[PDB]
Design brief:
Elements (H helix, E strand, L loop, with lengths): L2 E2 L6 H8 L3 E4 L6 H17 L3 E7 L2 E13 L4 E4 L2 E4 L1 E2 L6 H33 L2 H8 L4 E7 L18 E6 L10 E7 L11 E6 L7 E5 L5 E4 L3 H4 E6 L5 E7 L8 H11 L19 H25 L11 H25 L6 H29 L2 H4 L27 H11 L2
Helix pairs in contact: 2-3, 6-7, 6-8, 7-8, 7-9, 9-11
The protein binds the ligand CCc1cc(-c2ccncc2)cc(CC)c1Nc1cccc(CN2CCCOCC2)c1C(=O)O and 2-oxoglutaric acid.
Length: 434
């Protein structure tokens, strides 16, 4: 296989005919005022220590990202990739001083790139000519930006790009997942300073999915260049980042698919679960209104959602955003208290199944409704505990140390149920086989 750069004669027609949805807006098209502000904001975030490597999962293996990152975006919004949910450092939208000024700068960059994207999508539809406007607006309505930094000098060995001879990869071939269908992605690239591609300059690489026959494109990225993946390009093509010699930042603006990924969403889910609880007073005497299978099933599913998708995801990062912001401190305190009440709900259901007067047919209905949720709860707890205590997780500093919260010992009387549910789950299974 082979690749094409601006040095190759065929590069320009190949871009035109096979990559019409890839746009490059070079540094000269963007204002020098915006350049200075955005680049100063990158260095502020880096100096204050706001950028961290994510500990992600790829095919059962715990891996640090080669890039250090931070998610900036709408208040209460999240972005999930590689089984790792990032929580936004909020930018000042309608309705810490140096850090908040940088978050305001990246909102200003978001506003600019949104307008550039809309114009590019309007021109794309105009070219395709030779309901529509609402789709273009929503596909360019960037709700987050995920910032990136890498010093390639710090890495002892970078992987060779395997298919096209593109050289050293900073980031391997992938799609950006958890984005709205056909939504655009806009990237501001900030580099700090003759056979194939130039090894000292940063590039973004592109290939068609499933395809190593068709030669890939490697687009050089100089200081302040912007590139846009329009419409279905992100889905139909993989991209990689090829390393240059110097350090480089980027701001990758996305329309995150947050239908089950906002604070407002999960709080509303928690309140739905607690509709089955008598809510006169907050105490340990949790009594339930109904034991209808469907209501109990739902309750235990929400219990799992708030525990694994929100609490354990957040505390796995180890109060890391605490440096940049305290926006999630009270929400996470509230979600844990809501989760604690749902531990009382589970205990109340387990108390009901053991009651003497309950006929066995009603009992077995309840067991069938909750067993899948409790089984998954046991399995995910074991996974999350082991993920927190992995070799690579232990090597991180105290500021970035993963916590397995919530966690409690067998002797802890404040919690109604044990952390380990193995004996409870095996007993409930046994009862069904009676
Ligand atoms: C910011 C990191 C990232 C995000 C996403 C990603 C996935 C889905 N949605 C958004 C982003 C995909 C990749 C490619 C593996 C990356 N890259 C990575 C994420 C974690 C770890 C690594 C490092 N090694 C390197 C040697 C080759 O084996 C693969 C793992 C990479 C990588 O660049 O390869
Ligand atoms: O720009 C970067 O270096 C990494 C961001 C990226 O390419 C991605 O996550 O898809």
């Amino acid at each position: 296989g082979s690749h094409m750069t601006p040095k190759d004669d065929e590069f320009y027609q190949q871009w035109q005919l096979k990559y019409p949805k890839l746009i490059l807006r070079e540094a000269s098209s963007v204002s020098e005022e915006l350049h200075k502000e955005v680049q100063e904001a990158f260095l502020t975030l880096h100096k204050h220590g706001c950028l961290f490597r994510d500990l992600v999962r790829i095919q059962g293996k715990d891996l640090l990202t080669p890039v250090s990152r931070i998610l900036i975006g709408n208040p209460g919004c999240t972005y999930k990739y590689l089984n790792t949910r990032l929580f936004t450092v909020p930018w000042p939208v309608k309705g810490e001083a140096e850090i908040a000024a940088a978050c305001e700068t990246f909102l200003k960059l978001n506003d600019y790139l949104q307008i550039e994207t809309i114009q590019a999508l309007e021109e794309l539809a105009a070219k395709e000519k030779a309901q529509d406007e609402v789709d273009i607006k929503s596909r360019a309505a960037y709700n987050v930006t995920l910032l990136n930094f890498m010093d390639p000098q710090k890495m002892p060995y970078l992987k060779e790009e395997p298919y096209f001879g593109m050289g050293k990869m900073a980031v391997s071939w992938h799609h950006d997942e958890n984005l709205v269908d056909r939504s655009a992605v806009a990237v501001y690239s900030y580099s700090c300073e003759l056979e194939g591609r130039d090894p000292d300059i940063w590039h973004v690489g592109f290939k068609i999915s499933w395809d190593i026959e068709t030669p890939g494109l490697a687009i050089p990225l100089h200081q302040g260049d912007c590139y846009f993946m329009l419409d279905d390009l992100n889905a139909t093509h993989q991209h990689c980042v090829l390393a240059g010699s110097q350090p480089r930042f980027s701001s990758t603006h996305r329309v995150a698919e947050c239908s089950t990924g906002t604070l407002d969403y999960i709080l509303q889910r928690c309140q739905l679960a607690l509709q089955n609880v008598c809510d006169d007073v907050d105490n340990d005497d949790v009594s339930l209104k109904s034991f209808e299978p469907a209501v109990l099933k739902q309750g235990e599913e929400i219990h799992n959602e708030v525990e694994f998708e929100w609490l354990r995801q957040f505390w796995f990062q180890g109060n890391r955003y605490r440096k940049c912001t305290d926006w999630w401190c009270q929400p996470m305190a509230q979600l844990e208290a809501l989760w604690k009440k749902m531990e009382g709900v589970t205990n109340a259901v387990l108390h009901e199944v053991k009651r003497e007067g309950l006929p066995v047919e009603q009992r077995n209905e309840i067991l069938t409704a909750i067993l899948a949720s409790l089984t998954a709860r046991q399995n995910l707890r074991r996974e999350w505990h082991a993920r927190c205590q992995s070799r690579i997780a232990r090597t991180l500093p105290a500021d970035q140390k993963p916590e397995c919260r919530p966690y409690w010992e067998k002797d802890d009387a404040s919690m109604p149920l044990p952390f380990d549910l193995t004996d409870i789950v095996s007993e409930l299974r046994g009862q069904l086989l009676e």
